[PDB]
Amino acid sequence: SGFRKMAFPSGKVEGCMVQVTCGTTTLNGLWLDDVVYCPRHVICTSEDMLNPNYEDLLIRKSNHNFLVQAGNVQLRVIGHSMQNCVLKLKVDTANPKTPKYKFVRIQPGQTFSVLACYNGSPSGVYQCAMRPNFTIKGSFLNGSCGSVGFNIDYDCVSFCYMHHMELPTGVHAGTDLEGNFYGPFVDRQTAQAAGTDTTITVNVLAWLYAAVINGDRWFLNRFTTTLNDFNLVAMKYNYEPLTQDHVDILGPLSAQTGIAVLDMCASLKELLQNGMNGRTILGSALLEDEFTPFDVVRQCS
Amino acid sequence: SGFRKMAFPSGKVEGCMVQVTCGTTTLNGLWLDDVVYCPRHVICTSEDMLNPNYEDLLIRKSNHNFLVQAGNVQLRVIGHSMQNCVLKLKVDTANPKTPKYKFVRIQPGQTFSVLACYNGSPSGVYQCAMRPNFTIKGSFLNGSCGSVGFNIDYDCVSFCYMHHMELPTGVHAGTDLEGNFYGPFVDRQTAQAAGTDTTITVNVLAWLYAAVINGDRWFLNRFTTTLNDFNLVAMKYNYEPLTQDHVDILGPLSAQTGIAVLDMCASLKELLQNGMNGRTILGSALLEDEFTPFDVVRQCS
Ligand SMILES: *[C@H](O)[C@H](CCS(C)(=O)=O)NC(=O)[C@H](CC1CC1)NC(=O)c1cc2c(OC)cccc2[nH]1
Ligand SMILES: *[C@H](O)[C@H](CCS(C)(=O)=O)NC(=O)[C@H](CC1CC1)NC(=O)c1cc2c(OC)cccc2[nH]1
């Protein structure tokens, strides 16, 4: 038993991280086959960052202006293009460590592992959730741009995130592997606002099921409720409304524990209104919403 | 900025995990050079597990009684021996992905990354701290025995843990890579008790410094205290006594934030006596003790 925040094994992603330098700007890049993907703002000076015309700036850059390093081996750049906010550098060598991979755009509330790297060298790995306002609460220092988030299904790596910037509130922003930002953000040096964040209700319910499977107990009551009456409280505590589809995706856990979804909703309502009164759930004094139902099923079984 | 619980990149350790089967029992093994290290209880049936004489059981096992798989490649076992609670199987092939490695026995309060594997395939990675009672609060299911915990300095992997059992309280126990258990535990199928767990004070102080670095400052008071007066309060709330050496280890953080160790001890005293009054520190309602000072320095700088 046991339930901890868990990331995917990062070896398959470690095999693809490289270092990209343009002028004096150095960040990380993803090396897949004979292409290296990185943030386009690698081509910018401190002064271009205020209001950059990335098309004009990229036109002033030639292949030899990009220095790409994998370990002790430089990769000669033979082509370059721009897809949205992402720069694609075609190099002369195909990465022999290229795994079976996909480019996927995740929904808000879903989770993925982040491999924080600096100068192309992996530094750490940790689990993250896409907040409803399309930000993530990660750990990034200057030079971490190009680090990627991913999931792994058997032997296939679904890349879903590339880090670009940090917002004034301390949360982080980035794009998919096709250059499209998650949320209303742009890669300019301006203070940008994220929307109001809300709690992922289905994730809190999945986490409560995980707690029940692992022996945590005291919060379960012999009460029940309806979707309408539970939503009435969810609105009061800044929780997302609960839909019947969300009830359906909690089906496997509800069948494993033998506890109806609406019963767990009643328990959650009681926890929201009264608190915990000194107790913890899975060693936590707060209700966690960073675990999807699939994460719970994968970890506990 | 930001501060999440972070694990080391697991690729170097992924390159060493193999599957070891002895009879009907299958678990994980660590393949370094031409040796495979695993838990010895792999040679036990469900019947011997109650009170096994591992010498007698090992005597009745030959080299061919051990099946070792690295991926889809069979590793022919040419020798076998027992060192404490660890089984060493010498095979005919040396692991080409063997990293520079060390075997370390860690102190209570130090942290490391766990690579949970099943049937030789890595499943997840997460960060753990060795509790003062020599247990870890991890996530393990049946078949995870042989999974390892490690640290990485530059390019050297220091292995420090191998999982063996789960206690009745839900915590987990194991050995170092030389077979010696952490704590008073034995590898047999009995309900065993651990000592009283205490909070790692130096880790809580390092976590408070990390909070100050990332913007959280509300808990900083205009007060100071002596190590003796602080230990008086720490003894009441089940905190480990702070030593001058611990104060020295907190030196880099104290210099970076410009906040004396004793002033932060006063802040911790006030937090322990008054609570948090609804506020949070780094998005946490509890004082966290699973981050060493070096973890804080490495993550924030
Ligand atoms: C790339 O390595 C870098 C990562 C920063 S972090 C702290 O998240 O590791 N990215 C940036 O520095 C980006 C570059 C621009 C193209 C997106 N900028 C910011 O992260 C940034 C800019 C601001 C401003 O600008 C006015 C104001 C507040 C916060 C802020 N962050
Ligand atoms: C090995 O894969 C296995 C891991 C169990 S777990 C839940 O931690 O993933 N290890 C065991 O099953 C060990 C085997 C013996 C040699 C150490 N046993 C236990 O973990 C165990 C046995 C008990 C008993 O036995 C009466 C009672 C309570 C708890 C308990 N744990």
Residue numbers in the entry:
A (entry chain A), B (entry chain B): 1 to 301
Give verbatim excerpts from the published study on this entry.
All four compounds show a covalent linkage to the catalytic cysteine, Cys145, with contiguous electron density between the sulfur and carbon atoms and the C-S bond distance 1.76–1.77 Å. When the warhead is an aldehyde (compounds 1 and 3), the resulting secondary alcohol hydrogen bonds with the Cys145 backbone nitrogen. At P1, the installation of a methyl sulfone moiety at this position results in hydrogen bonding to the imidazole of His163 as in the case of the γ-lactam, whereas the other sulfone oxygen is hydrogen-bonded to the side-chain hydroxyl group of Ser144. Substitution of γ-lactam for a sulfone at P1 led to a 10- to 20-fold decrease in potency for the aldehydes but up to a 750-fold decrease for the nitriles (compound 5 versus 7), suggesting a greater dependence on P1 for nitrile binding. Compounds 3–9 showed clear evidence of reversible binding, whereas the more potent aldehydes formed a kinetically stable complex with Mpro, with compounds 1 and 2 having estimated half-lives of >69,300 s and 30,500 s respectively.
